[PDB]
């Protein structure tokens, strides 16, 4: 338990969002990671 | 959505709610178009 706490000592830097260009969502701003293949993250973040 | 009153009879014409950045980029394209239309070699409303 202590090590899990130790491993979680981080500061979360404010991320960025992009307006949705598709009709899957109503032009929502999705947190956008740097690098490609974030769509797997997008689908997981919003199963809806 | 701006407080300045303007008549819209073509809201039926399809359009989404762009993010402020999206509107600004569309505006920048309209501005480049206007400069080329008047053949403007100088910056227009760049502070704007």
From Swiss-Prot, chain A:
Coiled coil: none annotated. It is found in: Virion. Signal peptide: none annotated. It comes from the Viruses. Belongs to the turreted BTV-fold inner capsid family. Inner capsid protein that self-assembles to form an icosahedral capsid with a T=2 symmetry, which consists of 120 copies of VP2, with channels at each of its five-fold vertices. This capsid constitutes the innermost concentric layer of the viral mature particle. Displays NTPase, RNA 5'-triphosphatase (RTPase) and RNA helicase activities and probably participates in transcription of the viral genome. Helicase activity might be involved in unwinding or reannealing dsRNA during RNA synthesis. RTPase enzymatic activity represents the first step in RNA capping, which yields a 5'-diphosphorylated plus-strand RNA. Homodecamer; each decamer is made up of two conformers of VP2, called VP2A and VP2B. 12 homodecamers assemble to form an icosahedral capsid. Interacts with protein mu-NS; in viral inclusions. This is Inner capsid protein lambda-1. The gene is L3.
Curated annotation (Swiss-Prot), chain B:
This is Inner capsid protein lambda-1. The lineage of its organism: Viruses, Riboviria, Orthornavirae, Duplornaviricota, Resentoviricetes. Inner capsid protein that self-assembles to form an icosahedral capsid with a T=2 symmetry, which consists of 120 copies of VP2, with channels at each of its five-fold vertices. This capsid constitutes the innermost concentric layer of the viral mature particle. Displays NTPase, RNA 5'-triphosphatase (RTPase) and RNA helicase activities and probably participates in transcription of the viral genome. Helicase activity might be involved in unwinding or reannealing dsRNA during RNA synthesis. RTPase enzymatic activity represents the first step in RNA capping, which yields a 5'-diphosphorylated plus-strand RNA. It is found in: Virion. It comes from Reovirus type 1 (strain Lang) (T1L). It comes from the Viruses. Homodecamer; each decamer is made up of two conformers of VP2, called VP2A and VP2B. 12 homodecamers assemble to form an icosahedral capsid. Interacts with protein mu-NS; in viral inclusions. Signal peptide: none annotated. Belongs to the turreted BTV-fold inner capsid family. Disulfide bonds: none annotated.
């Amino acid at each position: 338990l202590l090590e899990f706490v130790l491993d979680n000592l981080y500061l979360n830097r404010h991320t960025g969002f992009s307006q949705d260009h598709t009709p899957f969502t109503e032009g929502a701003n999705l947190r956008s990671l740097p690098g490609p293949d974030a769509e797997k993250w997008y689908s997981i973040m919003y199963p809806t | 959505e701006t407080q300045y009153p303007v008549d819209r009879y073509l809201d039926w014409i399809p359009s989404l709610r762009a993010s402020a950045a999206t509107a600004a980029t569309f505006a920048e394209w309209v501005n480049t178009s206007m400069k080329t239309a008047f053949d403007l070699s100088d910056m227009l409303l760049e502070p704007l």
